[PDB]
Give the backbone structure.
Amino acid sequence: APVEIKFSHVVAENTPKGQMALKFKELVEQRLPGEYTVSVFPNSQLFGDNNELAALLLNDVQFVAPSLSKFERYTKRLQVFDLPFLFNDMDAVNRFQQGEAGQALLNSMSRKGIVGLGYLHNGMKQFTANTPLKQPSDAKGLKFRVMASDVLAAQFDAVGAIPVKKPFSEVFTLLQTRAIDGQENTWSNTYSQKFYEVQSHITESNHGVLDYMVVTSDAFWKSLPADKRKVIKEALDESIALGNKIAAEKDNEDKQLILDSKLSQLVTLSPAERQQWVDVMKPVWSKFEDQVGKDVIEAAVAANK
Ligand SMILES: [Cl-]
Ligand SMILES: [Cl-]
């Protein structure tokens, strides 16, 4: 039998990560026919947020691509990516990722058995709730789901909101049932998971980045013969490039599809409104500056300019 390579993730198929994973499957099976096959498991059908990294290290799955927010059990260094309003836009994110500090972060978990293979984009996060979030005061007392990140919890603490860490697979139902008031996510996730059907208002805040690290286990990666590993790595690189293109396309397409539905009201921030949000969030950077490194924050800030 060909060696089966399993790739699990938590998103819908028709998304940047969903498409990256399928492109990787296509390229491996084209270039190494009969030698390797890639099985892709979207929508948390095999492993979900809470168990995927444990599964990876057990070699129950060979590739995963978690949000950069979801690595705190293995390193505190990736917390930089969660800081609110650190990056102006995806161009700045990419520059930071491709610079020396960003490249070094790919190896931040290597002694824990996790090999960083590349960064894959999704997009900037927007707030949703059942009220406009024009100013920080509008979030006070509201319950927001967050990815399992202390930085993201602190982001909501900073405005007197109540953060709740929950796996991605639960978010739609939590919103639907009003167990939570709101959440934060990209247009692509908001559209593909139908969050906009159970939230009356989406505020275009662009207040943080949701990106991924594509990872494998050291044990699996070392178990490959070097020539086959090189072919697999090149296929992965090409799949990430395609996924990044899709990410940018979906960010525009899916915003428009949400607007077309007329089910959720878009809320835009004035410059002064945005600045109020920026200012109230800066203390989150101060809370984490030691763990993350002042030097690393400064490298990220400089990537904007
Ligand atoms: Cl885990
Ligand atoms: Cl929590």
The longest strand covers residues 114-124. The chain has one domain: 1-305. The chain is about 45% helix and 15% strand. Residues 164-165 surround chloride ion (ligand 2) (CB under 6 Å).
